[PDB]
Amino acid sequence: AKCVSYGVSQIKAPALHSQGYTGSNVKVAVIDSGIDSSHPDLNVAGGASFVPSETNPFQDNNSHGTHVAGTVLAVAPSASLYAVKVLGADGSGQYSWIINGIEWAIANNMDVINMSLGGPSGSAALKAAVDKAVASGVVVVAAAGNEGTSGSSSTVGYPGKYPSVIAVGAVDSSNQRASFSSVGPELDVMAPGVSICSTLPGNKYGAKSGTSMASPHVAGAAALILSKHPNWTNTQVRSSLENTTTKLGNSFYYGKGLINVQAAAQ
Ligand code: NA
Predict the structure, then answer these.
(1) CA atoms within 13 A on the CB side of 185
(2) Overall CATH class of domain 1-266
């Protein structure tokens, strides 16, 4: 059959879906390792690859992007997906490629960007890309990272670390922060990211854990909110999202807490 991550119910999407809103007409760029468009439960509307060795953004050699992309879809089934391939088959990519995929989203008028990816070093140009995307009105979401903790140090990666990005940590089914989830003052909200079941390449399904799994729930969520309020700006979308979370533990670890889409959409 299939699975829908349990995070769809947990972030309260079904209520949006039941109000009639499902991400309709919202453009979401899934900045990852491609998306296997050949999957039946997955419809990709377009995309582009910045990985020179891997020229087909609709071919996913890793599984990462298909999974992440199926999670967005699960939260917002009618969203339009763009596969922006910046991570090759090993799971890694240049910062350059990433900016390139980010510059492609701005230019193609994406409404939402999901980056379930991260690096330990800052880039002023990656920082400029995300800032420009947000300035262009795109809602940018990224994984907060899977670096655990380190004393008092922020373990939030880049770009999750920039203030213009919404960095998403991961919770499990019982809202407990996942051991691996990065922490730090830049962590903004949480979403499920432990053993999340989603689509895989070759008419498959599988679960994975990671802030990368959390990120797409928050991105599919912004797409639900948009479909209900297409005139809201990104700033508005994002604010509703942070302002209506279910508070959990302290902020260094959980951020503002878990997102509640029913509430966010108002
Ligand atoms: Na941030």
Answers:
(1) 2
(2) alpha beta
